[PDB]
Design an enzyme around this catalytic site. Structure first.
Site, PDB file in Angstrom:
ATOM      1  CG  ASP B  25      -1.843   1.166   1.211  1.00  0.00           C
ATOM      2  OD1 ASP B  25      -1.712   1.800   0.182  1.00  0.00           O
ATOM      3  OD2 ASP B  25      -2.816   1.132   1.951  1.00  0.00           O
ATOM      4  CB  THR B  26       2.079   3.459  -2.681  1.00  0.00           C
ATOM      5  OG1 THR B  26       0.904   3.547  -3.561  1.00  0.00           O
ATOM      6  CG2 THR B  26       2.795   2.442  -3.397  1.00  0.00           C
ATOM      7  N   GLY B  27      -0.194   4.106  -0.309  1.00  0.00           N
ATOM      8  CA  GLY B  27      -0.878   5.210   0.416  1.00  0.00           C
ATOM      9  C   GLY B  27      -0.528   5.169   1.945  1.00  0.00           C
TER      10      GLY B  27
HETATM   11  C1  XVJ Z   1     -12.709  -5.802   5.010  1.00  0.00           C
HETATM   12  C2  XVJ Z   1     -12.199  -4.441   4.297  1.00  0.00           C
HETATM   13  O1  XVJ Z   1     -13.347  -3.610   5.024  1.00  0.00           O
HETATM   14  P1  XVJ Z   1     -13.619  -2.318   4.388  1.00  0.00           P
HETATM   15  O2  XVJ Z   1     -14.010  -2.425   2.901  1.00  0.00           O
HETATM   16  C3  XVJ Z   1     -11.898  -1.217   4.556  1.00  0.00           C
HETATM   17  O3  XVJ Z   1     -10.699  -2.031   3.863  1.00  0.00           O
HETATM   18  C4  XVJ Z   1      -9.701  -1.444   3.766  1.00  0.00           C
HETATM   19  C5  XVJ Z   1      -8.792  -1.833   2.342  1.00  0.00           C
HETATM   20  C6  XVJ Z   1      -7.613  -1.051   2.182  1.00  0.00           C
HETATM   21  C7  XVJ Z   1      -7.141   0.014   3.197  1.00  0.00           C
HETATM   22  C8  XVJ Z   1      -5.747   0.792   2.908  1.00  0.00           C
HETATM   23  C9  XVJ Z   1      -6.164   2.124   2.506  1.00  0.00           C
HETATM   24  N1  XVJ Z   1      -7.059   2.358   1.351  1.00  0.00           N
HETATM   25  C10 XVJ Z   1      -8.494   2.902   1.685  1.00  0.00           C
HETATM   26  O4  XVJ Z   1      -8.874   3.908   2.365  1.00  0.00           O
HETATM   27  O5  XVJ Z   1      -9.194   2.642   0.074  1.00  0.00           O
HETATM   28  C11 XVJ Z   1     -10.432   3.246   0.063  1.00  0.00           C
HETATM   29  C12 XVJ Z   1     -10.698   3.548  -1.253  1.00  0.00           C
HETATM   30  O6  XVJ Z   1     -10.711   2.369  -1.938  1.00  0.00           O
HETATM   31  C13 XVJ Z   1     -11.482   1.663  -1.429  1.00  0.00           C
HETATM   32  O7  XVJ Z   1     -10.737   0.115  -1.652  1.00  0.00           O
HETATM   33  C14 XVJ Z   1     -10.132   0.112  -0.248  1.00  0.00           C
HETATM   34  C15 XVJ Z   1     -10.802   1.036   0.571  1.00  0.00           C
HETATM   35  C16 XVJ Z   1     -11.411   1.932   0.192  1.00  0.00           C
HETATM   36  C17 XVJ Z   1      -5.152   3.198   2.065  1.00  0.00           C
HETATM   37  O8  XVJ Z   1      -4.389   2.463   1.267  1.00  0.00           O
HETATM   38  C18 XVJ Z   1      -3.992   3.449   3.323  1.00  0.00           C
HETATM   39  N2  XVJ Z   1      -4.877   4.686   4.257  1.00  0.00           N
HETATM   40  C19 XVJ Z   1      -4.229   5.796   4.282  1.00  0.00           C
HETATM   41  C20 XVJ Z   1      -4.960   6.797   3.265  1.00  0.00           C
HETATM   42  C21 XVJ Z   1      -6.469   7.133   3.445  1.00  0.00           C
HETATM   43  C22 XVJ Z   1      -4.091   8.035   3.182  1.00  0.00           C
HETATM   44  C23 XVJ Z   1      -4.344   9.104   4.121  1.00  0.00           C
HETATM   45  S1  XVJ Z   1      -5.128   4.089   5.850  1.00  0.00           S
HETATM   46  O9  XVJ Z   1      -5.332   2.058   5.682  1.00  0.00           O
HETATM   47  O10 XVJ Z   1      -6.125   4.903   6.377  1.00  0.00           O
HETATM   48  C24 XVJ Z   1      -3.596   4.291   6.897  1.00  0.00           C
HETATM   49  C25 XVJ Z   1      -2.529   3.182   6.538  1.00  0.00           C
HETATM   50  C26 XVJ Z   1      -1.366   3.053   7.399  1.00  0.00           C
HETATM   51  C27 XVJ Z   1      -0.920   4.536   8.087  1.00  0.00           C
HETATM   52  N3  XVJ Z   1      -0.048   5.127   9.032  1.00  0.00           N
HETATM   53  C28 XVJ Z   1      -0.521   6.461   9.662  1.00  0.00           C
HETATM   54  S2  XVJ Z   1      -1.636   6.636   8.889  1.00  0.00           S
HETATM   55  C29 XVJ Z   1      -2.154   5.493   8.080  1.00  0.00           C
HETATM   56  C30 XVJ Z   1      -3.473   5.353   7.280  1.00  0.00           C
HETATM   57  C31 XVJ Z   1      -8.031   0.540   4.461  1.00  0.00           C
HETATM   58  C32 XVJ Z   1      -9.245  -0.238   4.862  1.00  0.00           C
HETATM   59  O11 XVJ Z   1     -14.694  -1.094   5.356  1.00  0.00           O
HETATM   60  C33 XVJ Z   1     -14.916  -1.661   6.704  1.00  0.00           C
HETATM   61  C34 XVJ Z   1     -15.365  -0.448   7.336  1.00  0.00           C
END
Ligand code: XVJ
EC number: 3.4.23.16
Lengths: 99, 99
Positions: B25-27
């Protein structure tokens, strides 16, 4: 280009004719932008992230230029902490991960 | 390897003597793993994403092996929905984004 990950992979995008900064996010299935005005019809959608679910506006078949590479696809607009380019558009510009 | 983004970039990791699947996860600034009882000292922390924040435990100098490449750094443990490999470890395996 080759983008390393010592810093956040922030790039300039062009959408609705405006420039913005966004994060290339391989962990994101979808592209989500902070609240903005976009032309066209939209529908309510919900998406989930690390902390729970948010309500977004789903805009289909939107043109977006990402470092000059054109993509046309779905853009979600809502209260994300940061503009994120997800895999739906990263695949269109030919992005891969390499190590 | 080269990893395309048609599907979620899930890979096998080895951490604390156990195998798991994790998202490259590059984000993600930091690495966040599913609930797991690791030995050693830790510090409470809150991390935020879409939907808000979650409470995690911060462990330091943790070795993870990612598709045979080793990395050592901070790992956050908590009720994340998915194991996330963030930039703090991705940089160590030389991972880059290429389009
Ligand atoms: C079983 C699945 O359950 P679910 O569906 C959610 O699953 C998930 C699947 C993947 C991710 C990874 C997250 N992706 C995302 O938000 O993607 C959305 C947009 O596209 C959709 O696809 C995926 C989800 C939807 C990002 O890549 C990384 N993020 C930061 C980003 C917002 C930049 C500020 S981070 O994780 O917030 C994070 C990580 C380490 C860190 N260190 C300090 S801060 C900090 C913050 C989270 C949850 O819902 C249940 C309620």
């Amino acid at each position: 280009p080759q983008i390393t990950l010592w810093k956040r992979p922030l790039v300039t995008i062009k959408i609705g004719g405006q420039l913005k900064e966004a994060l290339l996010d391989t962990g994101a299935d979808d592209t989500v932008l902070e609240e903005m005005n976009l032309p066209g019809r939209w529908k309510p959608k919900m998406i989930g992230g690390i902390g729970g679910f948010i309500k977004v506006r789903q805009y289909d078949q939107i043109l977006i230029e990402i470092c000059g590479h054109k993509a046309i696809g779905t853009v979600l607009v809502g209260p994300t902490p940061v503009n994120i380019i997800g895999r739906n558009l990263l695949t269109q510009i030919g992005c891969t991960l390499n190590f």
